[PDB]
Design an enzyme around this catalytic site. Structure first.
Site, PDB file in Angstrom:
ATOM      1  CE  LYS A   1      -4.501   1.577   1.840  1.00 29.47           C
ATOM      2  NZ  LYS A   1      -4.140   3.184   2.163  1.00 29.47           N
TER       3      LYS A   1
HETATM    4  N1  LIG Z   1      -1.565  -1.544  -3.957  1.00 27.02           N
HETATM    5  C1  LIG Z   1      -2.501  -0.943  -3.799  1.00 27.02           C
HETATM    6  N2  LIG Z   1      -3.748  -1.152  -3.935  1.00 27.02           N
HETATM    7  C2  LIG Z   1      -4.900  -0.487  -3.979  1.00 27.02           C
HETATM    8  N3  LIG Z   1      -4.748   0.689  -3.383  1.00 27.02           N
HETATM    9  C3  LIG Z   1      -3.662   1.075  -2.894  1.00 27.02           C
HETATM   10  C4  LIG Z   1      -2.543   0.452  -3.121  1.00 27.02           C
HETATM   11  N4  LIG Z   1      -1.392   1.264  -2.761  1.00 27.02           N
HETATM   12  C5  LIG Z   1      -1.810   2.533  -2.566  1.00 27.02           C
HETATM   13  N5  LIG Z   1      -3.429   2.415  -2.507  1.00 27.02           N
HETATM   14  C6  LIG Z   1      -4.199   3.520  -2.211  1.00 27.02           C
HETATM   15  O1  LIG Z   1      -4.966   3.084  -1.310  1.00 27.02           O
HETATM   16  C7  LIG Z   1      -6.311   3.782  -1.108  1.00 27.02           C
HETATM   17  C8  LIG Z   1      -7.327   3.062  -0.648  1.00 27.02           C
HETATM   18  O2  LIG Z   1      -7.351   3.313   0.914  1.00 27.02           O
HETATM   19  P1  LIG Z   1      -8.406   3.278   1.588  1.00 27.02           P
HETATM   20  O3  LIG Z   1      -8.069   2.861   3.054  1.00 27.02           O
HETATM   21  O4  LIG Z   1      -9.743   3.164   1.068  1.00 27.02           O
HETATM   22  C9  LIG Z   1      -8.572   5.227   2.000  1.00 27.02           C
HETATM   23  P2  LIG Z   1      -6.940   5.848   2.562  1.00 27.02           P
HETATM   24  O5  LIG Z   1      -5.854   4.737   1.999  1.00 27.02           O
HETATM   25  O6  LIG Z   1      -7.237   6.095   3.790  1.00 27.02           O
HETATM   26  O7  LIG Z   1      -6.737   7.242   1.725  1.00 27.02           O
HETATM   27  P3  LIG Z   1      -7.687   8.465   1.280  1.00 27.02           P
HETATM   28  O8  LIG Z   1      -8.971   8.518   2.055  1.00 27.02           O
HETATM   29  O9  LIG Z   1      -7.272   9.817   1.282  1.00 27.02           O
HETATM   30  O10 LIG Z   1      -8.288   8.051  -0.410  1.00 27.02           O
HETATM   31  C10 LIG Z   1      -6.379   4.196  -2.769  1.00 27.02           C
HETATM   32  O11 LIG Z   1      -7.288   5.130  -3.056  1.00 27.02           O
HETATM   33  C11 LIG Z   1      -5.154   4.268  -3.187  1.00 27.02           C
HETATM   34  O12 LIG Z   1      -4.650   5.730  -3.370  1.00 27.02           O
END
Ligand SMILES: Nc1ncnc2c1ncn2[C@@H]1O[C@H](COP(=O)(O)CP(=O)(O)OP(=O)(O)O)[C@@H](O)[C@H]1O
Ligand SMILES: [Cl-]
Ligand SMILES: [Cl-]
Ligand SMILES: [Cl-]
Length: 388
Positions: free
Chosen positions: A130
């Protein structure tokens, strides 16, 4: 079970795989837009229209935003997080941009309890790093224009501040120059695939988050390719890494684990440290197949496993520092004793260098200040987070 290491060496295995492809059905697209418009004229949705500045036909896109808690409701017209619809120059309604479905951390929803996961999902399980930046969506319009969006926006912001979408497009221009390809060519390829490329823009020289991305690691980390349809169909990660190499993206590290209990064990082991294969890791996005019937038809489905510490502490230090600068009371919720010390250290640093406050407010110097305090304390972040 830390024999498993996140790899960006999967593109070779993609030779034996083939990309999913499903064309758009204009009638199903029109019905989705109707359902979104109705929703917007009152599960609350917001519509924003944007001109695509580069479009030779004056293309416009509608961005649709839900509240993140509304995705827990059943019977949404779509579970897309990031969705842009358009009419072609021919008057055909299309999905221009389709994000992942909204996905949740372990134990945030009924579906993301380990019992629920163990029961209703099948592997193999893709564990994808992530990356810690902002999301960037890239697609090709019917008229050949490359569209670059942030989560809900596209185009440059009215002032001399660069938008996230423009910053993403400038990184894309650099990576395309490097490999000798054009925006036109990428737009034609994504349109041919009926696909949205999903990347994380990570660049400390643009904006600091929590994890550090120095110039050698800065750019667009491609983590997904989705089909531009109401349903959620995403590429297997080895095909994502192959696309990443072909179009000059940074690769998102991948681990494939067959057994769900091995997935749980691995993630719990990393949770102790908040680090993997030498590097700090904020979390994993786990990708698999899920059926409503716990033993029916299967659909692409994601959940996340965030590592709470030391990243929660770091985020608290950032917000506390911005409060210090703005005159609002720092919100100390955890790591009380070490945070009290951090804030006195911060106050000393800001007194010694009064330029730092404006820089910190513009998301530069945040990681350095945190690391300068940890060096001062002769501690690792993980040790600092363990004190409480
Ligand atoms: N390998 C991966 N697969 C999917 N999403 C990934 C990823 N690496 C990073 N991301 C990020 O992880 C986000 C999804 O995380 P979520 O928990 O749903 C919200 P967050 O990470 O807290 O950020 P945000 O609320 O500012 O969008 C995606 O929008 C993307 O930007
Ligand atoms: Cl076709
Ligand atoms: Cl984002
Ligand atoms: Cl076409």
């Amino acid at each position: 079970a830390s024999r498993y290491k996140a790899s960006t060496d999967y593109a070779k295995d993609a030779e034996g795989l083939t990309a999913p492809y499903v064309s758009q059905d204009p009638q199903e697209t029109a019905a989705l837009v109707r359902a979104l418009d109705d929703a917007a004229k009152k599960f609350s949705v917001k519509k924003t229209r944007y001109a695509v500045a580069s479009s030779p036909t004056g293309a416009e896109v509608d961005s649709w935003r839900f509240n993140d808690w509304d995705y827990k409701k059943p019977d949404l017209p779509t579970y897309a997080r990031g969705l842009f619809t358009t009419r072609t120059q021919h008057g055909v309604p299309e999905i221009a941009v389709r994000g992942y479905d909204k996905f949740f951390n372990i134990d945030e929803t009924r579906d993301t309890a380990w019992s629920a996961i163990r029961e209703r999902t099948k592997g193999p399980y893709e564990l994808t790093l992530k990356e810690n930046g902002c999301i960037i969506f890239i697609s090709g319009l019917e008229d050949g224009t490359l569209l670059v969006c942030s989560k809900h926006s596209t185009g440059d912001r009215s002032d001399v501040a660069l938008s996230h979408s423009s910053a993403g497009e400038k990184h894309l221009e650099a990576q395309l120059e490097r490999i000798g390809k054009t925006k036109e060519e990428l737009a034609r390829e994504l349109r041919k695939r009926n696909a949205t490329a999903v990347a994380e823009l990570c660049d400390d020289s643009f904006e600091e988050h929590i994890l550090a991305y120095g110039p050698d690691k800065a750019g667009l980390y491609l983590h997904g390719i989705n089909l531009n349809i109401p349903e959620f169909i995403t590429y297997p990660s080895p095909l994502v890494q192959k696309f990443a190499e072909d179009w000059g993206f940074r690769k998102t590290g991948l681990i494939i684990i067959d057994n769900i209990d091995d997935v749980k064990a691995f993630l719990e082991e990393v949770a102790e440290t908040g680090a993997h294969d030498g590097r700090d890791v904020e979390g994993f996005v786990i990708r698999c197949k899920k059926s409503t019937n716990p033993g029916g038809p299967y659909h692409d489905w994601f959940f996340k496993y965030k590592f709470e510490e030391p990243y929660l502490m770091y985020r608290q230090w950032r917000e506390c520092t911005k409060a210090l600068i703005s005159g609002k009371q720092p919100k100390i919720k955890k790591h009380v004793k070490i945070t009290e010390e951090y804030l006195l250290y911060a106050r000393k640093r800001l007194a010694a260098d009064p330029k730092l406050a404006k820089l910190y407010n513009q998301n530069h110097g945040i990681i350095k200040l945190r690391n300068d305090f940890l060096e001062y304390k002769n501690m690792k972040g993980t040790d600092a987070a363990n004190l409480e």
